[PDB]
Amino acid sequence: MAAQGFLLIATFLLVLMVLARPLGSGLARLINDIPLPGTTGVERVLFRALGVSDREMNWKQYLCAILGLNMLGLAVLFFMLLGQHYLPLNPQQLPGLSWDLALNTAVSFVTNTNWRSYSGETTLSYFSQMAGLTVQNFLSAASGIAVIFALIRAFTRQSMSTLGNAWVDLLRITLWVLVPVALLIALFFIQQGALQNFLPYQAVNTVEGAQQLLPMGPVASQEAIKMLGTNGGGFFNANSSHPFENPTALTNFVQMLAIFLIPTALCFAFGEVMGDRRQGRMLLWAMSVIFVICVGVVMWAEVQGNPHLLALGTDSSINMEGKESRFGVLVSSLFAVVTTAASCGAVIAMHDSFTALGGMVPMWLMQIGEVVFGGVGSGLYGMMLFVLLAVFIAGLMIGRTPEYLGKKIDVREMKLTALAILVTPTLVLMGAALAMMTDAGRSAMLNPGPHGFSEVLYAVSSAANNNGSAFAGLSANSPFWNCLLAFCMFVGRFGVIIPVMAIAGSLVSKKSQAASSGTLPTHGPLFVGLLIGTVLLVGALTFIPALALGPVAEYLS
Amino acid sequence: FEPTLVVQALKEAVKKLNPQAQWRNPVMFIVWIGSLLTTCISIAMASGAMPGNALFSAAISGWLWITVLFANFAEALAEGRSKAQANSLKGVKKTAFARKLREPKYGAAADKVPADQLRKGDIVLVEAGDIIPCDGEVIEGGASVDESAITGEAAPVIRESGGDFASVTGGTRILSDWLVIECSVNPGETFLDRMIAMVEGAQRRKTPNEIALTILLIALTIVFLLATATLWPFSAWGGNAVSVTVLVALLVCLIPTTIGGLLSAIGVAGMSRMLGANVIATSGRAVEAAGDVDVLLLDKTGTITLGNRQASEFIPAQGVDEKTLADAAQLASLADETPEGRSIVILAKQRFNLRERDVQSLHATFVPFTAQSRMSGINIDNRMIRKGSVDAIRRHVEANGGHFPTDVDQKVDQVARQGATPLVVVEGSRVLGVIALKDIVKGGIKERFAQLRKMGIKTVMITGDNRLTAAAIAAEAGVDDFLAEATPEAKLALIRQYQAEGRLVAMTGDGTNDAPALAQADVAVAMNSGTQAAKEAGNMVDLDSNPTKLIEVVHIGKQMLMTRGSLTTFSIANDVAKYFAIIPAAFAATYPQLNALNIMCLHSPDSAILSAVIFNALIIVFLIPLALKGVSYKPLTASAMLRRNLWIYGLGGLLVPFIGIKVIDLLLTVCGLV
Amino acid sequence: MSGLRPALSTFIFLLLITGGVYPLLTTVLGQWWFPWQANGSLIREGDTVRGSALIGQNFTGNGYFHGRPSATAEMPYNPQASGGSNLAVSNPELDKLIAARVAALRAANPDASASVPVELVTASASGLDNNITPQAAAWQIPRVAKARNLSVEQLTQLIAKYSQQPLVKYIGQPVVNIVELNLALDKLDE
Amino acid sequence: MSAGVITGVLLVFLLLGYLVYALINAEAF
Ligand SMILES: CCCCCCCC/C=C/CCCCCCCC(=O)OC[C@H](COP(=O)(O)OCCN)OC(=O)CCCCCCCCCCCCCCC
Ligand code: BEF
Ligand SMILES: [K+]
Ligand SMILES: [K+]
Ligand SMILES: [Mg+2]
Structure with missing residues (x-):
C-alpha cells in the first residue's frame, strides 16, 4: 500500500497546482489595485456608500485599521456569546456561555485559531454559529490576506510611503473571493449529504428500542468557509469526522484541496506580482519538499500501527483506533499532515490515538512556525520572515551586504525579523512550563506517562501558532486553561502581525538597486536548501528537548 | 605585540572582569553569571550545605573562568587602545605657565604662575619661545606667532596691536620677540579646552557586520536559554528531574562562545597583516572598516604636499x-x-x-x-x-x-x-x-588617486590654507573636491555630515588641527611625520607617510572581510553541531530509554558537560591561529563563494564538535577523572 | 486610520453580508435543489423516523450486522455527545478494552475465523460510524445467516447491494451502510 | 511555589529581559 500513498499524494498536489494557478492571477490583479473584470461600477457605488473614498495608508494607519476591525469583532462576539439566551434562533433553550469560555471562544475565533474547549451540539445556538463564528471566519481570513497584500506591495513598490487602502482590501477580498468560492463549496457539500436547515433537533426511534436525538443546524455554510479560509472551527464536537460535516470521500478530498488552495494561490501571485515567476516557484518547492517528506513519514508510522493489536487477536496491526472507516488510514494520515502544516486545525481523526511518530510529525510541523503552506496569509509572511533571515545569514557567510528582490536590507529589519521569529517559541515553551508546574494545568491530561506531557505541549503549541487542532484528551475547559490559551493565541497572532507591518513600512520606502557581487540569486537548489536548513534548524534547536521527553520518550519506551 | 603590551592587556582583562564592564557583552556576561553560580554551588557543596560532588563543579567554574578571562584578554588586545586620546593636548594644558605683568606696560616684573590662575582682564607677558598661555588680544608689541595647530601652515604669522591681527590663542608658540597679552576668556573654555573636548567625546561607530553578527548571537542565546531553562519543569514531570548544576553548566555550554570570540580573532589577525604592510594599526575594526570605506578626506599641508613650501x-x-x-x-x-x-x-x-x-x-x-x-x-x-x-x-x-x-x-x-x-x-x-615659494606635491600621487577613483572611493581634500593654494594643489594632485580655510570644527562637522548618510569615512591627516576629525573618522590614518596629537587621535600610523597608503589598506581590508566570512560559517556550524553533540546527555536521568539517543556513547552527563566546557575554551583559543592562516583570496561570485564556504568551512565546523568532544571525553575517562 | 465611519461601515456591511445573506442564500438553494440531504437524509417508515442514513445506531441483537464501538458520553452511539475515546497507544486501558472486545466477538461468532477484524475491535473517531468495509461485514455472515435462516449467497448479495466504492480507489475505502443494511434485512423476512 | 523555583523563574525572566533589551539596542552592545 505504498503505490496508493504515492498516487494519493501525486493526485492531491497535481489537482492543487491546476486549481491554484488560475486563482493566482486574480489575487495578482487585487494586489495591483486593479479592479476585477466586471466589478468596477458596483465597486464605486459600494465604496461611496460606505464612505471609503480611496486615500492610501502608510504602515501605521494600515496596522491600526486591521487592529481596530479585529477589536470591534472581538467585543461583538464576546457579548454575543454571553447573551445568547436573548437572541433568536434558539430551538433548544440553551443558556449563555460563561465568562471564561466566552472569552476563550471570542479570542480564538477572532485570531483565526478556532480552538474548541466546548461541545457545539450542546453549547451554541444557531445564531452564535451563524451570525458569530462564521462572520469571524470571513473577517479573520480577510484580515490575514490583507496583511500579506501589504507586505507584497512593500516588496514591489519603489520609493513610496503608502501601502494602499485597508478597507478596500478587506471588501474586495471578502466579496469577490471568499463568498463565491465558499458558496460553491457549500452547495457541493449539501449535495453530498451535509446539513443546511434551521429545524429543531430530530427525535429518532432506532430500529431496536433505543432512542436518538439528532442535531440539525446549518452546517454546510460554516463548513465551506471554515475550510476555505483555513479557520478549522467545527460545528460539532468531533470536528470534521462527523457524518454531517464530511459525508463522503469526495467531500474530504475537496476539503483537503480547499485548505491548501489560497496559500498556494498567494505564492503564485507573489511570483507574478514581481514579474519574476522563479521567485514564487522557489517558495512552492521549499514548502513542497517538507510536506511530502512529512506525509510519507506519517503514513509509514500509521501503517505500522499498534503492535499489540496483532497479538490480542486482531488480524492486522494497522492503527484504526481514532479513524473513521469511511476514510482509510492513508487518507487520515495525509489529512493530519495537511491540517497541521496548513494551520487549518480541522481534524479528520483523533490525533491522540495516533502512534508516537504519527503524533510527533504534525506537532513538529505546528511548532516550526507553520511556514509550510501555512495559514491563509499567515503562512506566506511567516515564510517571508524566514526568507529574510536566510538572506541575512547568507550575506553573513559571504561577507557582503544582504539583499532580497533588489532592495537592500538593513539591521532594523533584522531586529524586527528576529523578534517576530522568536515570539511564538517563547509563548510555547513558557506556557507549557507554567502549565506543567501547576496542579490545575497538569490535571487535565487524560493519559499517563510522557503522553500526558505530549498532550499539554500539543495544546499550547496549537494555541500559540493559531492552529486550533488538539489531542482532545486534554480536559481544557477551566478558567486556568481558557485564560492561558486565550493569552497565547492573542499574543502570538498580533505580536507577529505587528513586526510584519513594521518591516513592510520600512521596505516600502527603499528603491531596488542593481546587481552586484553581494547579490546571490534567491532561486535554484542552493537557496531552497539554505531556506529549508534555516527553518528546520530553528525549529529543532528550540523544540528538541521538548520533543525528546514527549513523543520520543513514548516511542522509545 | 612587544612584552609590555601583553602585560597591559592582561591587567586590562582582569580589570574588565568587573560586572559593570562585562555587562556590555551578552554572551560573555551569561558565561560570567554561570561561572559565578557554579563557584557558589561548589562552595555550598564543599561546606556541607548541599549534597553532591564539589570538585566537578569546581572544575567547571574554573574552566568557565578561564574562558571569560581569555575572552576579555583577546578583546583587550584587539580593541584595547582603539580610542582617541588627548594626552598630548592635556600635557600642554597642564605643564603650561606664564608671567603675570603688574603695571600692564612692558617696564615691570614677571610673576611666573600656572596658566589656570589667569582670568578675564589679566595682563600676561610672553617672550621668544614661551607658549602663549591662553586667548587674548595683544596690547603692546608685535611678534611672529607659530599658529600651526589652528591653521596648519607652519609659516609664522605676525601678531601686533592696534590693527586686526591682534588676537592670539593659547598653545601656539611665539617666535620673534615680546608681546603683552591680555586674557579674554575665563580658564573654562579656551581653544585648547575646546579641542581637548572634541577629541575625547567623539565616538566611533560599529560596522554593519558587527551589528548583524551581534543580533544573530543574541537570537541564538535566547533560543538556548528558553530550551535549557524550561527543561526543568518538563523533566521534573516524569519523576526524577535534571540537577541544578547540570542545568547551569548546560546553559553556559550550549551558547555560542565561538561566535563571540570571532570578533577578536579577526581583530588580531587584521592588525598583524597591517603591520606586515608597514602600517601600525591599533584597532581591529579599523581594518574591516577600511575594507568597505566610501570617502577619503585628505589634509593638504603635511599630507599631500611636503609641508614646508620650498622655493620654485x-x-x-x-x-x-x-x-x-x-x-x-x-x-x-x-x-x-x-x-x-x-x-x-x-x-x-x-x-x-x-x-x-x-x-x-x-x-x-x-x-x-x-x-x-x-x-x-x-x-x-x-x-x-x-x-x-x-x-x-x-x-x-x-x-x-x-x-x-x-x-x-x-x-x-x-x-x-x-x-x-x-x-x-x-x-x-x-x-x-x-622669489615665488610654492609648495610641492609629494610624488607619484596623481596615479594613485586615479586608482582610488577607480576603486569607487570619493576623494575630498580638506585644508586650512587659502583657496588659491587649495585650488592649485587640488588641480595638480587630481582630487575631486577641496575645502580651503577649514578650522578643526569644520573638518569634524564635515566628517559627521558624510558619515551621517550611512557611509563610512576614512580621513588621512597629520597635524594637530586634524585630531578632532581623526578621532571621529572610521579609518584614521596619521602620517608618521605628524604631530603626537595626530598620531594619538588616529587609529593607525602610516610609517611610509604617504597619503596613498589607503590603496593597500583597503586591499588588506577586503581580504579580512573574506576571512571573516569563512570563519563566520565555521563558527555557526560549530555551534549548531555542538548543540546536538551535548544536549542528548541531559535526558539520561529522566527516562532510561533515551540512552538510545546518545549516539557518541559519551560516558555520563557530568563527563559530557565537562568535555563541553573544555572544548569551548580550546576552540576560542584556537580560533586565532585559524584567522592568521587566512583563506584563498580569489574573486568569486556570491553563490560560488557561499558554496565554497559551506563545503570546506561549514562542513569542517560540523565535524569538529563531535570528534573534539569525543576525544576530550576519552582522555577524561582514560585519565580517571571521569 | 481606524476612522470611525469607514471602520464601522465596513464591519456592519460585512456583518450583514457574511451573517445573513450568505447563510440564507445557501439555505434557500440547498432546500430547493437538495431537500433530502439538507433536512438530514432521514429514513421514514410511515410517521416514525428510523434514523439518518449517515449516523449509525447501536445494534446489539444477534440477527443484525454490528458496527464498530462508539465510546460516546452517555450511551453508545449518542448523537448529542459525539467524540471518540482518546486513549493513546501506550495507555494500558486501551489494551484492557480491546482484549474484552475481542473476547466478546469470538464468543458471539463461534463459526468464523479466530482473527477478529481490526475495525470491529477499535472505536471510531466520532462514535457515530455507520460504515464497515465489506470484509469486516462478511466476517459475520455465519452468525446472521444462522439467526435469520438465510443462505450465505443471499446475505453476501445483500451486503454487495449496500456497498459504496469511492470515485477513485485511493481516496477512501469501500464501505457498507449498516443502518439500511439491517432495515432491508428486516424487510426481507417480512 | 518554593524558594528554588521562584529564584530560578526570577533569574530566567531577568536574563530574557536583558537579552531582548540588548537585541533592541544592538549598537551599544
Ligand atoms: C549533524 C547535525 C546537523 C546540523 C546542521 C548544521 C549545518 C550548518 C552548515 C553545514 C552545511 C553543510 C553543507 C554541505 C553541502 C554543500 C553545499 C553545496 O555544495 O550545495 C549543493 C547544491 C548546490 O547546487 P548548485 O547547482 O551547485 O548551485 C546552483 C545555485 N542555485 O544544493 C544544496 O543542496 C545546498 C545545500 C546547502 C544547505 C545548507 C544548510 C545550512 C544552512 C545554515 C543555517 C544555519 C542558520 C542558524 C539558524 C538560526
Ligand atoms: F594641514 Be592642512 F592644510 F590643514
Ligand atoms: K486555524
Ligand atoms: K478544532
Ligand atoms: Mg596637515
Missing part, C-alpha cells in the same frame, strides 16, 4: 640681471635655518655656480626677522640685502625715498595667483625681483 622659481624685474637676483638671494638667506631659507640657498646654488661665496666665517652681520620691519637679510661690506614680503619692502623702500617700481606689483600679483607665497630681494634699493 626666480622672477626678476626689468633688466636686474637675474644672476644678480639669485646671488643676492643665496647670500641673503644663508644664515637662515627654516626650510624656506635653506631651500632658497639650495635652489640658487644648484641653478647657478656660486659655491665660492657661501661661508659663515666672514664678518657680515645677519639681521633676523624683527617683526617691526618684517624683513630678514644680511649686511656685508658696503652691502645691505633684505628679503621680505611685498608690503614690508614697500614701506622700507618708501621710507628711504627710492620710488617703488610698478613691474613688481603686477609680478607679485601674478605669483600670488599662481598659488605661491612671493618674496622680494632688495640690495638697499632697486628691488631685484620676486
